[PDB]
Write an enzyme that holds these catalytic residues in place. Structure first.
Site, PDB file in Angstrom:
ATOM      1  N   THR A  73       0.801  -1.216   0.000  1.00 30.81           N
ATOM      2  CA  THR A  73       0.000   0.000   0.000  1.00 30.81           C
ATOM      3  C   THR A  73       0.848   1.288   0.000  1.00 30.81           C
ATOM      4  OG1 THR A  73      -1.562   1.335   1.309  1.00 30.81           O
ATOM      5  CG2 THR A  73      -0.250  -0.361   2.491  1.00 30.81           C
ATOM      6  N   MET A  74       0.505   2.198  -0.902  1.00 34.09           N
ATOM      7  CA  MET A  74       1.161   3.493  -0.973  1.00 34.09           C
ATOM      8  C   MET A  74       0.675   4.424   0.114  1.00 34.09           C
ATOM      9  SD  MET A  74       3.402   3.418  -3.276  1.00 34.09           S
ATOM     10  CE  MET A  74       3.969   2.424  -4.646  1.00 34.09           C
ATOM     11  N   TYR A 164     -10.248  14.412  -4.251  1.00 34.54           N
ATOM     12  CA  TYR A 164      -9.515  13.924  -5.428  1.00 34.54           C
ATOM     13  C   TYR A 164      -8.886  15.096  -6.198  1.00 34.54           C
ATOM     14  CZ  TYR A 164      -8.931  11.650 -10.009  1.00 34.54           C
ATOM     15  OH  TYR A 164      -8.405  11.099 -11.163  1.00 34.54           O
ATOM     16  N   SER A 167      -5.840  16.749  -4.418  1.00 28.66           N
ATOM     17  CA  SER A 167      -4.621  16.007  -4.583  1.00 28.66           C
ATOM     18  C   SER A 167      -4.044  16.113  -5.984  1.00 28.66           C
ATOM     19  CB  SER A 167      -4.819  14.543  -4.198  1.00 28.66           C
ATOM     20  OG  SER A 167      -5.533  13.856  -5.206  1.00 28.66           O
ATOM     21  N   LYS A 168      -4.915  16.206  -6.993  1.00 29.59           N
ATOM     22  CA  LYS A 168      -4.457  16.295  -8.382  1.00 29.59           C
ATOM     23  C   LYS A 168      -3.946  17.715  -8.730  1.00 29.59           C
ATOM     24  CE  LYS A 168      -5.189  12.043  -9.860  1.00 29.59           C
ATOM     25  NZ  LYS A 168      -4.128  11.110 -10.339  1.00 29.59           N
ATOM     26  N   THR A 203     -13.336   0.309 -12.815  1.00 27.34           N
ATOM     27  CA  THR A 203     -13.627   1.121 -11.635  1.00 27.34           C
ATOM     28  C   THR A 203     -14.339   2.432 -11.956  1.00 27.34           C
ATOM     29  OG1 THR A 203     -11.972   0.365 -10.052  1.00 27.34           O
ATOM     30  CG2 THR A 203     -12.356   2.784 -10.129  1.00 27.34           C
TER      31      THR A 203
HETATM   32  N1  LIG Z   1     -10.357   6.191 -15.482  1.00 20.27           N
HETATM   33  C1  LIG Z   1     -10.603   7.511 -15.416  1.00 20.27           C
HETATM   34  O1  LIG Z   1     -11.868   8.044 -15.684  1.00 20.27           O
HETATM   35  C2  LIG Z   1      -9.542   8.513 -15.039  1.00 20.27           C
HETATM   36  C3  LIG Z   1      -9.791   9.861 -15.262  1.00 20.27           C
HETATM   37  C4  LIG Z   1      -8.854  10.851 -14.936  1.00 20.27           C
HETATM   38  C5  LIG Z   1      -7.659  10.435 -14.373  1.00 20.27           C
HETATM   39  N2  LIG Z   1      -7.427   9.097 -14.177  1.00 20.27           N
HETATM   40  C6  LIG Z   1      -6.166   8.737 -13.571  1.00 20.27           C
HETATM   41  O2  LIG Z   1      -5.672   7.553 -14.138  1.00 20.27           O
HETATM   42  C7  LIG Z   1      -4.987   6.839 -13.112  1.00 20.27           C
HETATM   43  C8  LIG Z   1      -5.450   5.368 -13.138  1.00 20.27           C
HETATM   44  O3  LIG Z   1      -6.832   5.293 -12.804  1.00 20.27           O
HETATM   45  P1  LIG Z   1      -7.777   4.037 -13.192  1.00 20.27           P
HETATM   46  O4  LIG Z   1      -9.117   4.579 -13.448  1.00 20.27           O
HETATM   47  O5  LIG Z   1      -7.042   3.201 -14.165  1.00 20.27           O
HETATM   48  O6  LIG Z   1      -7.924   3.359 -11.751  1.00 20.27           O
HETATM   49  P2  LIG Z   1      -8.064   1.820 -11.317  1.00 20.27           P
HETATM   50  O7  LIG Z   1      -8.374   1.023 -12.530  1.00 20.27           O
HETATM   51  O8  LIG Z   1      -9.051   1.856 -10.223  1.00 20.27           O
HETATM   52  O9  LIG Z   1      -6.594   1.330 -10.855  1.00 20.27           O
HETATM   53  C9  LIG Z   1      -6.069   1.772  -9.611  1.00 20.27           C
HETATM   54  C10 LIG Z   1      -4.782   1.001  -9.312  1.00 20.27           C
HETATM   55  O10 LIG Z   1      -4.244   1.519  -8.115  1.00 20.27           O
HETATM   56  C11 LIG Z   1      -4.062   0.519  -7.137  1.00 20.27           C
HETATM   57  N3  LIG Z   1      -4.301   1.029  -5.772  1.00 20.27           N
HETATM   58  C12 LIG Z   1      -5.480   1.408  -5.170  1.00 20.27           C
HETATM   59  N4  LIG Z   1      -5.199   1.794  -3.890  1.00 20.27           N
HETATM   60  C13 LIG Z   1      -3.863   1.672  -3.682  1.00 20.27           C
HETATM   61  C14 LIG Z   1      -3.045   1.919  -2.575  1.00 20.27           C
HETATM   62  N5  LIG Z   1      -3.538   2.385  -1.408  1.00 20.27           N
HETATM   63  N6  LIG Z   1      -1.696   1.679  -2.697  1.00 20.27           N
HETATM   64  C15 LIG Z   1      -1.145   1.188  -3.869  1.00 20.27           C
HETATM   65  N7  LIG Z   1      -1.958   0.962  -4.959  1.00 20.27           N
HETATM   66  C16 LIG Z   1      -3.292   1.199  -4.851  1.00 20.27           C
HETATM   67  C17 LIG Z   1      -5.022  -0.587  -7.520  1.00 20.27           C
HETATM   68  O11 LIG Z   1      -4.609  -1.866  -7.053  1.00 20.27           O
HETATM   69  P3  LIG Z   1      -5.097  -2.413  -5.598  1.00 20.27           P
HETATM   70  O12 LIG Z   1      -6.490  -1.950  -5.275  1.00 20.27           O
HETATM   71  O13 LIG Z   1      -4.959  -3.907  -5.653  1.00 20.27           O
HETATM   72  O14 LIG Z   1      -4.249  -1.860  -4.493  1.00 20.27           O
HETATM   73  C18 LIG Z   1      -5.016  -0.477  -9.029  1.00 20.27           C
HETATM   74  O15 LIG Z   1      -3.968  -1.258  -9.557  1.00 20.27           O
HETATM   75  C19 LIG Z   1      -5.303   7.550 -11.794  1.00 20.27           C
HETATM   76  O16 LIG Z   1      -4.251   8.391 -11.350  1.00 20.27           O
HETATM   77  C20 LIG Z   1      -6.471   8.421 -12.126  1.00 20.27           C
HETATM   78  O17 LIG Z   1      -6.570   9.568 -11.296  1.00 20.27           O
HETATM   79  C21 LIG Z   1      -8.340   8.115 -14.483  1.00 20.27           C
HETATM   80  C1  LIG Z   2     -15.381  14.284 -16.441  1.00 18.86           C
HETATM   81  C2  LIG Z   2     -14.752  13.315 -15.431  1.00 18.86           C
HETATM   82  C3  LIG Z   2     -15.752  12.799 -14.386  1.00 18.86           C
HETATM   83  N1  LIG Z   2     -16.095  13.877 -13.454  1.00 18.86           N
HETATM   84  C4  LIG Z   2     -17.373  13.921 -12.917  1.00 18.86           C
HETATM   85  C5  LIG Z   2     -17.715  14.952 -12.031  1.00 18.86           C
HETATM   86  C6  LIG Z   2     -18.980  15.050 -11.512  1.00 18.86           C
HETATM   87  C7  LIG Z   2     -19.929  14.109 -11.880  1.00 18.86           C
HETATM   88  N2  LIG Z   2     -21.254  14.235 -11.310  1.00 18.86           N
HETATM   89  O1  LIG Z   2     -22.010  13.287 -11.496  1.00 18.86           O
HETATM   90  O2  LIG Z   2     -21.547  15.277 -10.698  1.00 18.86           O
HETATM   91  C8  LIG Z   2     -19.644  13.062 -12.765  1.00 18.86           C
HETATM   92  C9  LIG Z   2     -18.365  12.978 -13.280  1.00 18.86           C
HETATM   93  C10 LIG Z   2     -14.958  14.466 -12.735  1.00 18.86           C
HETATM   94  C11 LIG Z   2     -13.928  14.977 -13.743  1.00 18.86           C
HETATM   95  N3  LIG Z   2     -13.602  13.948 -14.726  1.00 18.86           N
HETATM   96  S1  LIG Z   2     -12.181  13.117 -14.575  1.00 18.86           S
HETATM   97  O3  LIG Z   2     -11.863  12.436 -15.839  1.00 18.86           O
HETATM   98  O4  LIG Z   2     -11.317  14.100 -13.928  1.00 18.86           O
HETATM   99  C12 LIG Z   2     -12.500  11.833 -13.348  1.00 18.86           C
HETATM  100  C13 LIG Z   2     -12.788  10.512 -13.749  1.00 18.86           C
HETATM  101  C14 LIG Z   2     -13.052   9.558 -12.755  1.00 18.86           C
HETATM  102  C15 LIG Z   2     -13.032   9.874 -11.382  1.00 18.86           C
HETATM  103  C16 LIG Z   2     -13.355   8.840 -10.283  1.00 18.86           C
HETATM  104  C17 LIG Z   2     -12.192   8.620  -9.274  1.00 18.86           C
HETATM  105  C18 LIG Z   2     -14.593   9.385  -9.528  1.00 18.86           C
HETATM  106  C19 LIG Z   2     -13.728   7.485 -10.902  1.00 18.86           C
HETATM  107  C20 LIG Z   2     -12.755  11.203 -11.019  1.00 18.86           C
HETATM  108  C21 LIG Z   2     -12.479  12.178 -11.984  1.00 18.86           C
END
Ligand SMILES: NC(=O)c1ccc[n+]([C@@H]2O[C@H](COP(=O)([O-])OP(=O)(O)OC[C@H]3O[C@@H](n4cnc5c(N)ncnc54)[C@H](OP(=O)(O)O)[C@@H]3O)[C@@H](O)[C@H]2O)c1
Ligand SMILES: C[C@@H]1CN(c2ccc([N+](=O)[O-])cc2)CCN1S(=O)(=O)c1ccc(C(C)(C)C)cc1
Ligand SMILES: NC(=O)c1ccc[n+]([C@@H]2O[C@H](COP(=O)([O-])OP(=O)(O)OC[C@H]3O[C@@H](n4cnc5c(N)ncnc54)[C@H](OP(=O)(O)O)[C@@H]3O)[C@@H](O)[C@H]2O)c1
Ligand SMILES: C[C@H](CCC(=O)NCCC[N+](C)(C)CCCS(=O)(=O)[O-])[C@H]1CC[C@H]2[C@@H]3[C@H](O)C[C@@H]4C[C@H](O)CC[C@]4(C)[C@H]3C[C@H](O)[C@]12C
EC number: 1.1.1.146
Lengths: 265, 263
Positions: A73-74, A164, A167-168, A203
């Site tokens: 865990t991070m 979220y 932190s970003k 997710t």
């Molecule tokens: N998918 C999107 O809509 C989206 C949008 C904007 C930005 N991003 C960015 O893309 C990146 C990847 O997101 P994703 O959607 O691909 O997420 P994800 O599929 O939920 O993957 C998260 C990964 O992080 C690990 N993790 C969770 N908690 C942890 C902890 N405490 N310590 C170490 N590892 C941990 C998970 O493994 P375990 O749970 O096994 O620990 C998993 O491998 C993130 O930085 C996210 O902010 C994603």
């Molecule tokens: C456009 C997307 C999704 N966002 C969002 C924001 C608000 C709502 N809402 O229903 O109000 C729905 C979606 C937040 C901003 N982005 S994102 O790509 O930065 C993002 C994607 C996924 C997430 C998780 C962690 C909630 C899955 C957070 C942000």
């Protein structure tokens, strides 16, 4: 920070040693797989070993030059620092640090959840700093690269993602400042910040499954992120909307920063 | 939604304002300005002796109340207590002015994780805790939260990474909850202030070596923070140059957020 004025070539990653965090699923897993397919050395991490193993296995199956995992865990700064060390021995060096993982989070209003805010800062931000510090010496040697995965919510404000977003935003303020530091100190380590929109990871799909928001394909996303690192670009933008992709840049900020830096010394 | 009026001092007369990090600099001048307005103030910081001194000059100045409560915002418990303690001392809360910062380290970043963590805790997390704790009362008066921030919380600079991180985090968090309060119809306004070089002793100590653009009067700077807060503006930009505030605006972000919420 000088990017390469070339076209990307998948061979650029062959023989390269790369860490990818949160790589047991989502965009992280997909990055491991692209790096595998490019014949790179790869060490992946996440909390759960079983899911990690599958990635490792398919990486080798995919043509990885080598591939391992270390689980943890991070939330654990000590694990973070140690992970980079163990991972360094494993590959005998480090070319690329891909910082990808986040704490589990779902859409919600903010009421009292300081514990979620702090865990977000700790996991989403602080752990990235600890991992960078731990990896720099190796990265100075290879002239490597830090890739920080961020979000639209890391450049503009949205409801439902307060902790979220905090932190970003932090990641941007920090790594954007040390990029400028590395450039006066002449540290030849590139820093790439990636601004992603909604991506179709499992997710993320679950967390929004409840209006219509168009998600982008995780596989193409992952590759755009690797391409930006390889090419030493400052920012990579990736969303399904062309309007979003455009409006998520900040030309005012580039001008100002440029005027200040050719001004002060 | 801003108040559709010109500012007039008497808007603050009688109001119940907390001012954090108010022992010196911009914090102190806000206490003073609010005092000439008639407000009920309660200041806080770590410096007992100096807090006392300011509280005393606030009473000389026109304040309806003046209380101080020394302590460190490294301490989340004291942060939580402090708002309660100050709420009693005033019988309500109209304005929460969040201004304090830990001591900023002007230097290349190397490996000081503990200083990063502490910047985050003091500069950001403690602002959240304070706001969580002051919400219930703020809702009742339909009050305002003012968050003080910096050029370096909107764009990036070398030599202030930990600080930039914390101020950037302020923007994300409070801009996100601002959009949440609108849709859930919470009538508590939020103002983010973006300040250029202000001539506080802290600043002047910091920029002594290099020669910059003129620093701006901390008394004017402090009033503009209060004004914007009173008028419930979303953002206040203050620098001795109007060029700085023109160059720092990001229309893209504004348009993108407009788009997301027509949706
Ligand atoms: N998918 C999107 O809509 C989206 C949008 C904007 C930005 N991003 C960015 O893309 C990146 C990847 O997101 P994703 O959607 O691909 O997420 P994800 O599929 O939920 O993957 C998260 C990964 O992080 C690990 N993790 C969770 N908690 C942890 C902890 N405490 N310590 C170490 N590892 C941990 C998970 O493994 P375990 O749970 O096994 O620990 C998993 O491998 C993130 O930085 C996210 O902010 C994603
Ligand atoms: C456009 C997307 C999704 N966002 C969002 C924001 C608000 C709502 N809402 O229903 O109000 C729905 C979606 C937040 C901003 N982005 S994102 O790509 O930065 C993002 C994607 C996924 C997430 C998780 C962690 C909630 C899955 C957070 C942000
Ligand atoms: N002045 C500028 O050029 C400038 C530029 C950009 C942004 N700003 C912003 O303006 C705000 C005020 O700046 P300033 O120049 O007026 O600062 P300052 O003169 O240094 O005052 C900072 C205040 O915070 C208090 N403080 C420090 N550590 C604390 C702690 N652990 N717990 C509680 N209080 C603590 C200090 O009081 P004690 O030591 O008595 O505890 C002091 O009263 C800051 O948020 C800053 O980011 C200023
Ligand atoms: C002075 C600089 C910004 C100057 C700047 O960015 N200007 C460059 C050129 C901009 N322009 C294009 C407008 C000018 C060129 C055309 S023009 O003709 O307009 O000159 C800003 C940026 C970061 C600021 C510090 C941080 O807050 C941390 C800390 C907070 C304390 O509380 C006060 C102390 C301290 C150390 C701060 C002091 C000061 O406040 C700093 C150095």
């Amino acid at each position: 920070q000088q990017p390469l004025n070339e076209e990307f070539r998948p061979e650029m990653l062959q023989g390269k040693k790369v860490i990818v965090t949160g790589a047991s699923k989502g965009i992280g897993r997909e990055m491991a797989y692209h790096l595998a397919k490019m014949g790179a050395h790869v060490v992946v991490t996440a909390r759960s070993k079983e899911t990690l193993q599958k990635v490792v296995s398919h990486c080798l199956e995919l043509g990885a030059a080598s591939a391992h995992y270390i689980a943890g865990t991070m939330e654990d700064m000590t694990f973070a620092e140690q992970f980079v060390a163990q991972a360094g021995k494993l590959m005998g060096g480090l070319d690329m640090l891909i910082l990808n993982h986040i704490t589990n989070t779902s859409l919600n209003l903010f009421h009292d959840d300081i514990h979620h805010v702090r865990k977000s800062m700790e996991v989403n931000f602080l752990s990235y700093v600890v991992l960078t510090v731990a990896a720099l010496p190796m990265l100075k040697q290879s002239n490597g690269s830090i890739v920080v995965v961020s979000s639209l919510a890391g450049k503009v404000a949205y409801p439902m993602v307060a902790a979220y977003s905090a932190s970003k935003f932090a990641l941007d303020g920090f790594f954007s400042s040390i990029r400028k530091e590395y450039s006066v100190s002449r540290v030849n380590v590139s820093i790439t910040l990636c601004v992603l929109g909604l991506i179709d990871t499992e997710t993320a799909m679950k967390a929004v499954s409840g209006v219509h928001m168009q998600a982008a394909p995780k596989e193409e996303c992952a590759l755009e992120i690797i391409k930006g690192g390889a090419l030493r670009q400052e920012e990579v933008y990736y969303d399904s909307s062309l309007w979003t992709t455009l409006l998520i840049r900040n030309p005012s900020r580039k001008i100002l920063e440029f005027l200040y830096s050719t001004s002060y010394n």
